[PDB]
Amino acid sequence: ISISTLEGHLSSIMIAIPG
Amino acid sequence: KIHEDNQKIISKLESLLLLKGEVESIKKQINRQNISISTLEGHLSSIMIAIPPDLKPIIGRDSGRALAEVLKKP
Amino acid sequence: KIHEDNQKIISKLESLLLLKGEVESIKKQINRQNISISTLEGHLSSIMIAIPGLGKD
Amino acid sequence: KIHEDNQKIISKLESLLLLKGEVESIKKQINRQNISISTLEGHLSSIMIAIPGLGKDPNDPTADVEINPDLKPI
């Protein structure tokens, strides 16, 4: 559960797909 | 008396064989964790870029708006 | 009858001996995911923050 | 034959009693896992609050402070 909530935060925060 | 003790042993052994569904339930939990980690590694792999060797990822302020100004145009 | 009951006990002991390899496979899978969490912690520790040129509004 | 059967049962039971130290090893790996998860939570907490707009609606993440510095205007 802790990783799943950590995944939900890290999705919108980190990705901008630069490549 | 020995037969009574043997039936008691078999009775406790059936309880110890009940743990197989519990171990498979653990295996599904680690499998769910493995999917969550793999999505995280997929997300961190996209933001990683080279720095003018080191491969340091860069985060932006709002939606990667600063990433267009700083980085070299390809 | 007693000897037949003990052969049933050993058969259930053999099934529990099969359960040990499944437990050890769980331990190896916990170890592999723990190495994965360590290296993503490494990639999060090395990260750059970018600040834009103009405030949008 | 029954006594020889009991020695086989005891010997296989001792092979099953070797597994308790392995379960204790599962406990140490799970403890080391949640320290690593806590470090990941600590890193993402510092990033999302230093960088604006990345709260994901927690109702102003910089405003998580307790409010009683003898203020009471209300």
Curated annotation (Swiss-Prot), chain A:
Post-translational modification: Phosphorylation on serines by host CK2 is necessary for the formation of viral factories.
Region Interaction with the L polymerase, residue ranges: 4-19
UniProt comment concerning the protein's domains: The N-terminus consists of a long intrinsically disordered tail. The central part contains the coiled-coil multimerization domain (MD). Forms a four-stranded coiled coil structure. The C-terminus constitutes the alpha-helical domain (XD) that binds to the nucleocapsid (N-RNA complex).
Family as reported in the entry's similarity comment: Belongs to the morbillivirus P protein family.
Assembly description: Homotetramer. Interacts (via multimerization domain and XD domain) with polymerase L; this interaction forms the polymerase L-P complex. Interacts (via N-terminus) with N0 (via Ncore); this interaction allows P to chaperon N0 to avoid N polymerization and non-specific RNA binding before encapsidation. Interacts (via C-terminus) with N-RNA template (via Ntail); this interaction maintains the P/L complex anchored to the nucleocapsid template during the sequential transcription. Interacts (via C-terminus) with protein C this interaction allows C to associate with the ribonucleocapsid.
Main function: Essential cofactor of the RNA polymerase L that plays a central role in the transcription and replication by forming the polymerase complex with RNA polymerase L and recruiting L to the genomic N-RNA template for RNA synthesis. Also plays a central role in the encapsidation of nascent RNA chains by forming the encapsidation complex with the nucleocapsid protein N (N-P complex). Acts as a chaperone for newly synthesized free N protein, so-called N0, allowing encapsidation of nascent RNA chains during replication.
Protein name, as recorded: Phosphoprotein
Organism: Measles virus (strain Edmonston B)
UniProt gene name: P/V
Included range, full protein: 358 to 376 of 507
Swiss-Prot record, chain D:
Stretches the record annotates as Interaction with the L polymerase: 38-54
Free-text note on domains in this protein's UniProt record: The N-terminus consists of a long intrinsically disordered tail. The central part contains the coiled-coil multimerization domain (MD). Forms a four-stranded coiled coil structure. The C-terminus constitutes the alpha-helical domain (XD) that binds to the nucleocapsid (N-RNA complex).
UniProt PTM: Phosphorylation on serines by host CK2 is necessary for the formation of viral factories.
Function: Essential cofactor of the RNA polymerase L that plays a central role in the transcription and replication by forming the polymerase complex with RNA polymerase L and recruiting L to the genomic N-RNA template for RNA synthesis. Also plays a central role in the encapsidation of nascent RNA chains by forming the encapsidation complex with the nucleocapsid protein N (N-P complex). Acts as a chaperone for newly synthesized free N protein, so-called N0, allowing encapsidation of nascent RNA chains during replication.
S-S bonds: none
Protein name (Swiss-Prot/TrEMBL): Phosphoprotein
Taxonomy, superkingdom: Viruses
Sequence similarity: Belongs to the morbillivirus P protein family.
Region of interest: Multimerization: 1-53
Assembly and binders: Homotetramer. Interacts (via multimerization domain and XD domain) with polymerase L; this interaction forms the polymerase L-P complex. Interacts (via N-terminus) with N0 (via Ncore); this interaction allows P to chaperon N0 to avoid N polymerization and non-specific RNA binding before encapsidation. Interacts (via C-terminus) with N-RNA template (via Ntail); this interaction maintains the P/L complex anchored to the nucleocapsid template during the sequential transcription. Interacts (via C-terminus) with protein C this interaction allows C to associate with the ribonucleocapsid.
Species the sequence originates in: Measles virus (strain Edmonston B)
